[PDB]
Design a protein around this ligand. Structure first.
Ligand SMILES: NCCCCCC(=O)O
Length: 79
């Protein structure tokens, strides 16, 4: 969840909505989008994070090192 859309959180480590080990923002060759532009609200996409620099108020999104488990939000404490 967004216990602060750029202020406070915990599951932002690198785990999806439940706790699926997110990615490191590498790329689609192995597996990972091309996220990183500055025209985004923010950019807390630190190595392997979950935030909302795209458009997912419902919850901080985040992809992962693999397809079957490419994405979902982060297991960040509620808000
Ligand atoms: N609204 C989420 C789309 C951007 C999240 C990253 C991705 O989909 O590759």
């Amino acid at each position: 969840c967004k216990t602060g859309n750029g202020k406070n959180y915990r599951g932002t480590m690198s785990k999806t909505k439940n706790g699926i080990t997110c990615q490191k923002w590498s790329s689609t060759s192995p597996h990972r989008p091309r996220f990183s532009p500055a025209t985004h609200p923010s950019e807390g996409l630190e190595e392997n994070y979950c935030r909302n620099p795209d458009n997912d108020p419902q919850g901080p999104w985040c992809y992962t090192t693999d397809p079957e488990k490419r994405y979902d939000y982060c297991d960040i404490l509620e808000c």
